[PDB]
Amino acid sequence: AKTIKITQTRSAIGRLPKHKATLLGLGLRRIGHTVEREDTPAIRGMINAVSFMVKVEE
Amino acid sequence: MFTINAEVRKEQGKGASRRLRAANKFPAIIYGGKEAPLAIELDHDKVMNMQAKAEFYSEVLTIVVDGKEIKVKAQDVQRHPYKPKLQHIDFVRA
Amino acid sequence: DKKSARIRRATRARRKLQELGATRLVVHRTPRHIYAQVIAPNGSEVLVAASTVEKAIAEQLKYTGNKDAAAAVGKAVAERALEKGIKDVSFDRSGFQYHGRVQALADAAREAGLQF
Amino acid sequence: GSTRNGRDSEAKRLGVKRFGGESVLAGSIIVRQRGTKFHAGANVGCGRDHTLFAKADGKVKFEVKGPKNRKFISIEAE
Amino acid sequence: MLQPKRTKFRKMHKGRNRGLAQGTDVSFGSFGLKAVGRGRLTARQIEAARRAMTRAVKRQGKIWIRVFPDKPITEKPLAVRGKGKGNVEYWVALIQPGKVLYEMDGVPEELAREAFKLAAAKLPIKTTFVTKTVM
RNA sequence: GGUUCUCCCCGAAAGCUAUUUAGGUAGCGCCUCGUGAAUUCAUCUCCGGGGGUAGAGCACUGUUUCGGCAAAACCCGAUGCAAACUGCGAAUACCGGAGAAUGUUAUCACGGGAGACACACGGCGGGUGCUAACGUCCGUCGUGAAGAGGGAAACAACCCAGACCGCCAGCUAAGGUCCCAAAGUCAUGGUUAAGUGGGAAACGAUGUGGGAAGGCCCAGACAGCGUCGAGUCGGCCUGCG
RNA sequence: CCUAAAGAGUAACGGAGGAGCACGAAGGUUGGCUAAUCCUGGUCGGACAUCAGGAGGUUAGUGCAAUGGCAUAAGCCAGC
RNA sequence: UCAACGGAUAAAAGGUACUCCGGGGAUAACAGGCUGAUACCGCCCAAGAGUUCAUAUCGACGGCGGUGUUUGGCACCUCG
RNA sequence: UGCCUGGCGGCCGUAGCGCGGUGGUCCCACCUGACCCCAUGCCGAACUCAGAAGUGAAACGCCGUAGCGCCGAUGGUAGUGUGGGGUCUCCCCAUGCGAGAGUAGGGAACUGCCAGGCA
Ligand SMILES: [K+]
Ligand SMILES: [K+]
Ligand SMILES: [K+]
Ligand SMILES: [K+]
Ligand SMILES: [K+]
Ligand SMILES: [K+]
Ligand SMILES: [K+]
Ligand SMILES: [K+]
Ligand SMILES: [K+]
Ligand SMILES: [K+]
Ligand SMILES: [K+]
Ligand SMILES: [Mg+2]
Ligand SMILES: [Mg+2]
Ligand SMILES: [Mg+2]
Ligand SMILES: [Mg+2]
Ligand SMILES: [Mg+2]
Ligand SMILES: [Mg+2]
Ligand SMILES: [Mg+2]
Ligand SMILES: [Mg+2]
Ligand SMILES: [Mg+2]
Ligand SMILES: [Mg+2]
Ligand SMILES: [Mg+2]
Ligand SMILES: [Mg+2]
Ligand SMILES: [Mg+2]
Ligand SMILES: [Mg+2]
Ligand SMILES: [Mg+2]
Ligand SMILES: [Mg+2]
Ligand SMILES: [Mg+2]
Ligand SMILES: [Mg+2]
Ligand SMILES: [Mg+2]
Ligand SMILES: [Mg+2]
Ligand SMILES: [Mg+2]
Ligand SMILES: [Mg+2]
Ligand SMILES: [Mg+2]
Ligand SMILES: [Mg+2]
Ligand SMILES: [Mg+2]
Ligand SMILES: [Mg+2]
Ligand SMILES: [Mg+2]
Ligand SMILES: [Mg+2]
Ligand SMILES: [Mg+2]
Ligand SMILES: [Mg+2]
Ligand SMILES: [Mg+2]
Ligand SMILES: [Mg+2]
Ligand SMILES: [Mg+2]
């Protein structure tokens, strides 16, 4: 029901493969790109994994 | 005669514990009896001076925590490996 | 100790029967008595039993711990097994030599109509 | 000077091939091992080189049984 | 010079020297010399510090050496280029912060401090004087 | 050694195995084109697994120090050490199952065409070497290679960041804002006097800031000579020099 | 076997050892069995031979390296 | 028989300063570079020597640095 | 129904050793014989058979007792994934995971099927 807005804040260049796969899983494509996703534990786990390069709008 | 003041700890674990010691306090635990264990903070310099006296380990001490007084004996102490500091104390309820 | 030494003797065969998942005919033997049990594959369920401690069988016998008593118990356990309808069992000598009284029990159970 | 060492043997690719909960066909090797680090439980066979293999289809289950705390592998028929 | 009487193996991997020490308390005597730094102590350094320490107390009281050089160090000869690990040249003890190196008993603290000061000048690692605690 | 017009799309490798093989070549891995079959594959969450690494420990295998008992070992204790020690034991990683969302179909098979099999540096875990080398050999990730732009004076491999084309628009990243040279001679509170900042150790020393105790003290201390009248003595921790 | 980073794999003129066989029983099966070491006593007999009992609990054994195994023994003995 | 153990032929040694060609700074010798074990130059501790007295002059056992004259390590530049 | 005993499983030391007490009608054990069935690389010890005078000594089972083995928190510490930092042979910070050892404390087990004896 509830959605969250996620924005990519740093580059993916030089990041671990897993991190690149996570951004892809969130559907983030470039710095500044914002996406809207359902707030679930699976989504939260992804955000958690790349928290250093995304910001969340609750 | 030895009286100690002690807050109750909000956070626990490595991060919190290291923050305490950076702010010149140190963690401690009271256990024993039928009451559940109580995790506390102590001022470092104050207790460091007390425990220099050898009566600290023999005598029964009082810990004033949230008003209430608790009679304890110093059970175990973790010292810093080379600096003259205390990392942790175990107090057993007397 | 004798009992522990016998439990050792019995383990190989018992573990094997558990693996095969066979209905056992477990025999126990003392100087005075001899017992018999048909235990189910799971191992925690006795189907039938017979012994020289039972007064139905013991009253007919001269002595309880001899070949002739074992022969009687062998006949007894087999008849009760065929009553429920088991037939196929595996004999478990339980660490005793297949000889004398144990053999006597086993022979009597075969003749009665158990298939082993 | 010189060295008297410099030798080794080929690696034998031992170890667990199918972990807990994995579905295996009968025949499937579960573990390759020197000696029985794991023992065969229900529906598992032990080969001449102590390979544990499924004797039935089902799910692999590891379990510790007995006083020695021995590790058994069994197949839960599924 | 301290050295194992025998060993399973002649030569040892370099390894690393992370972590804090075990044996951080004065267990035997009344006064200790404790490592504050991290490093290696050779058998020769351990002996040189022992001699200075012993002489300073005029062979009064008792001295324990808590550290033992059990790690063999190899070196390659000069003008050698590979062609196998070098030969064992000396032995070391790995020291971590907090390790009590030496203990001493049956002397005044004043004299113990002096002896350990003389000993410390022979060692490559920073040390500190420590005393036995009740707990 | 050299190999001649243009534009568009994708885009490696410098590994393994074998080789009279080592600067060659072959199969496989990695690229490309095509055809075909799966909600195939990836990320996260939950669930099911095995582990013997880090750490730790010392019953075992070895090694080590000191004691208490004894014909000066064991027995009874205290204390360490281990790549080839383990009565313990993570994080991660890996295998499998389930579920959502997202993704350039990224997975798998077969077929057409390859190139490549001299790698480099940086991080992390290591062997070797002197915990020497812009050294050497592995693992794993990143970048260069095959990657321009901004930063690090200058500087493949570091930091930020991935250039379809145009603009005399705007916002940011690392990094910066006295002049060279774009932007604070910005604000508040501290520290340093060494141009420290802007090269380095053991160790030395009334440099100076902060913190916590202690000894002595108007029953007159410390310095100077019983005299004179307020703070002083000598260590600890710590910031900057 | 270690290096090898708790799945597999993983290099060096890295650290250590082995093989180039043996066995018609040392294979199969059935039945049975359980070690080392030390202490106490005992002809020759001694530190150590064989006998008895106790403690011990696999510290033994496994045809040959090392590692992983082995009591239901994979160790030891006999029948066929 | 292929142990050079995926085995060139069944059958396989040397010299060349009389030399030659194709190549390589993928690889040595010179010099440069990186490094600084070694070398050289300092310093710290102070047992002791110095009639007495550690420090006039020395300085054991050990410790910490500097330089880039040595011997080396590496193989980065140069073998059209 | 309860108690006790035997057998077969479920449960692996909180279930094991020790120490103190306790049980023999049945059961179990030792025990009594051995010419035989069968047995000893000698031995009726064991195995086995034929028995039931004796005995609960040993063994076995049951009850008590922390004396050990053993089990074992809480807290702290070590390590560590990801991101960041330093004085970078080693560490620190944010966040997540978090031992081993030790401490308090505990511990003298629990449970199904069948049979037998007793009240
Ligand atoms: K190839
Ligand atoms: K292809
Ligand atoms: K040990
Ligand atoms: K690397
Ligand atoms: K790239
Ligand atoms: K300056
Ligand atoms: K045989
Ligand atoms: K045989
Ligand atoms: K060859
Ligand atoms: K000539
Ligand atoms: K040249
Ligand atoms: Mg942390
Ligand atoms: Mg191997
Ligand atoms: Mg390591
Ligand atoms: Mg592209
Ligand atoms: Mg370790
Ligand atoms: Mg090649
Ligand atoms: Mg290559
Ligand atoms: Mg490489
Ligand atoms: Mg490295
Ligand atoms: Mg290199
Ligand atoms: Mg390097
Ligand atoms: Mg190229
Ligand atoms: Mg660039
Ligand atoms: Mg640039
Ligand atoms: Mg520039
Ligand atoms: Mg702006
Ligand atoms: Mg300007
Ligand atoms: Mg201003
Ligand atoms: Mg300067
Ligand atoms: Mg592995
Ligand atoms: Mg791994
Ligand atoms: Mg590889
Ligand atoms: Mg070959
Ligand atoms: Mg030429
Ligand atoms: Mg070159
Ligand atoms: Mg040169
Ligand atoms: Mg040179
Ligand atoms: Mg190279
Ligand atoms: Mg040049
Ligand atoms: Mg040049
Ligand atoms: Mg030219
Ligand atoms: Mg904890
Ligand atoms: Mg624990």
mmCIF file of C-alpha atoms in Angstrom, chain E residues 15-82:
data_model
loop_
_atom_site.group_PDB
_atom_site.id
_atom_site.type_symbol
_atom_site.label_atom_id
_atom_site.label_comp_id
_atom_site.label_asym_id
_atom_site.label_seq_id
_atom_site.Cartn_x
_atom_site.Cartn_y
_atom_site.Cartn_z
ATOM 1 C CA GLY E 15 52.502 -14.476 9.316
ATOM 2 C CA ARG E 16 51.179 -11.233 10.791
ATOM 3 C CA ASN E 17 51.111 -9.689 14.262
ATOM 4 C CA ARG E 18 47.613 -8.332 14.888
ATOM 5 C CA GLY E 19 45.617 -8.150 18.110
ATOM 6 C CA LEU E 20 46.319 -7.418 21.772
ATOM 7 C CA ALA E 21 48.374 -9.661 24.049
ATOM 8 C CA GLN E 22 47.437 -12.465 26.379
ATOM 9 C CA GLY E 23 49.377 -12.522 29.658
ATOM 10 C CA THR E 24 48.794 -8.841 30.461
ATOM 11 C CA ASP E 25 48.861 -9.252 34.263
ATOM 12 C CA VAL E 26 51.763 -9.536 36.691
ATOM 13 C CA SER E 27 51.136 -13.178 37.612
ATOM 14 C CA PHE E 28 54.345 -14.369 39.299
ATOM 15 C CA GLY E 29 56.181 -11.409 40.836
ATOM 16 C CA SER E 30 55.212 -7.983 42.175
ATOM 17 C CA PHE E 31 56.491 -5.736 39.358
ATOM 18 C CA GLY E 32 56.375 -6.118 35.584
ATOM 19 C CA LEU E 33 57.659 -4.601 32.364
ATOM 20 C CA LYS E 34 54.742 -4.443 29.917
ATOM 21 C CA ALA E 35 54.913 -3.905 26.149
ATOM 22 C CA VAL E 36 52.978 -0.838 25.004
ATOM 23 C CA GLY E 37 54.079 -1.234 21.386
ATOM 24 C CA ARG E 38 53.901 -4.031 18.826
ATOM 25 C CA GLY E 39 56.856 -5.849 17.309
ATOM 26 C CA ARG E 40 59.335 -8.705 17.459
ATOM 27 C CA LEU E 41 61.799 -9.406 20.270
ATOM 28 C CA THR E 42 64.848 -11.397 19.234
ATOM 29 C CA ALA E 43 66.475 -13.871 21.600
ATOM 30 C CA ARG E 44 69.531 -11.566 21.760
ATOM 31 C CA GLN E 45 67.406 -8.579 22.804
ATOM 32 C CA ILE E 46 65.663 -10.663 25.478
ATOM 33 C CA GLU E 47 69.055 -11.736 26.859
ATOM 34 C CA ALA E 48 70.583 -8.237 26.732
ATOM 35 C CA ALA E 49 67.605 -6.835 28.653
ATOM 36 C CA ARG E 50 67.785 -9.718 31.142
ATOM 37 C CA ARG E 51 71.491 -9.146 31.844
ATOM 38 C CA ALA E 52 71.053 -5.400 32.416
ATOM 39 C CA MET E 53 68.060 -6.044 34.676
ATOM 40 C CA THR E 54 69.807 -8.764 36.705
ATOM 41 C CA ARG E 55 72.984 -6.718 37.182
ATOM 42 C CA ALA E 56 70.955 -3.696 38.320
ATOM 43 C CA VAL E 57 69.357 -5.673 41.180
ATOM 44 C CA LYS E 58 72.755 -7.200 42.082
ATOM 45 C CA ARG E 59 71.270 -10.703 41.741
ATOM 46 C CA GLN E 60 68.768 -9.981 44.519
ATOM 47 C CA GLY E 61 65.143 -11.093 44.245
ATOM 48 C CA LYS E 62 63.729 -13.154 41.380
ATOM 49 C CA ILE E 63 63.166 -12.411 37.684
ATOM 50 C CA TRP E 64 60.695 -14.171 35.380
ATOM 51 C CA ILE E 65 60.905 -13.934 31.594
ATOM 52 C CA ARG E 66 57.319 -14.302 30.374
ATOM 53 C CA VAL E 67 58.225 -14.179 26.657
ATOM 54 C CA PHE E 68 59.896 -16.996 24.735
ATOM 55 C CA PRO E 69 61.394 -16.686 21.203
ATOM 56 C CA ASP E 70 59.744 -19.610 19.417
ATOM 57 C CA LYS E 71 59.398 -18.149 15.895
ATOM 58 C CA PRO E 72 62.317 -18.917 13.536
ATOM 59 C CA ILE E 73 63.366 -16.126 11.165
ATOM 60 C CA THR E 74 65.161 -17.020 7.932
ATOM 61 C CA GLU E 75 67.511 -14.831 5.910
ATOM 62 C CA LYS E 76 69.023 -15.256 2.446
ATOM 63 C CA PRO E 77 72.838 -14.886 2.172
ATOM 64 C CA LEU E 78 74.412 -11.834 0.528
ATOM 65 C CA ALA E 79 74.744 -11.807 -3.280
ATOM 66 C CA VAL E 80 72.015 -14.418 -3.750
ATOM 67 C CA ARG E 81 69.012 -14.023 -6.031
ATOM 68 C CA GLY E 82 63.726 -18.003 -5.268
#
